[PDB]
Structure formats: structure tokens, C-alpha cells
């Protein structure tokens, strides 16, 4: 049961971090998803994950 949730980093200010959830990977970087912990900026308005 989840009513309100988001994936917004209000400009560069007030930004957020996370427990990593790396599902898609480019030809440059393939990363550990539930072993590492991550940091986030505005340049990432991609949606949410489970873990």
C-alpha cells in the first residue's frame, strides 16, 4: 500500500542519496546493485526501485 512517492531532486539544491539499485548498464559501466550505496543529483530524474 503506497499512495504518495516520487523520484525528484529539486534542482541541484536539496538533493538525495540511496542504497544502490543498478538494473540497466551501458558499455562503459556494469555495477554492483545490492552491495554498494549511491549518491544522486538533479541530472537523474529516472523512477524508483524495490531494494
Amino acid at each position: 500500500t503506497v499512495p504518495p512517492r516520487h523520484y525528484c531532486i529539486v534542482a541541484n539544491p536539496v538533493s538525495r542519496d540511496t542504497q544502490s539499485s543498478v538494473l540497466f548498464d551501458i558499455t562503459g559501466q556494469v555495477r554492483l546493485r545490492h552491495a554498494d550505496q549511491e549518491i544522486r543529483l538533479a541530472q537523474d530524474p529516472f523512477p524508483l526501485y524495490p531494494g
Binding site: 529539486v10 534542482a11 541541484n12 539544491p13
Partner: protein, 50 residues
Amino acid sequence: EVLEKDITPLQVVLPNTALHLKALLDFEDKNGDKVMAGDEWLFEGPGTYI
């Protein structure tokens, strides 16, 4: 549409007053070239801006 209000585009020119701008999340947004960081500018003369 989010994070909005009604700003009256304030103006000033010469000895009159001055504008102590900074860059909250900005690096290079204005005409001549490209600012280095979240640093600060002065504003003296005729018209205002964004």
C-alpha cells in the same frame, strides 16, 4: 507545473542602487560566456534580466 509565484522584475541603474547576484545551481547561463561556479556578480546600469 510546480514551484511558482509572481515576481515583479525589479530594476535599478547607476549610483541609484546595486545587485549582489550569486549562482544557486548555475554555472554559465548568460550572454558573453560561461561562469565558473556558484560565484557572485555585480549589476550597474539600465535594464534588469531573468
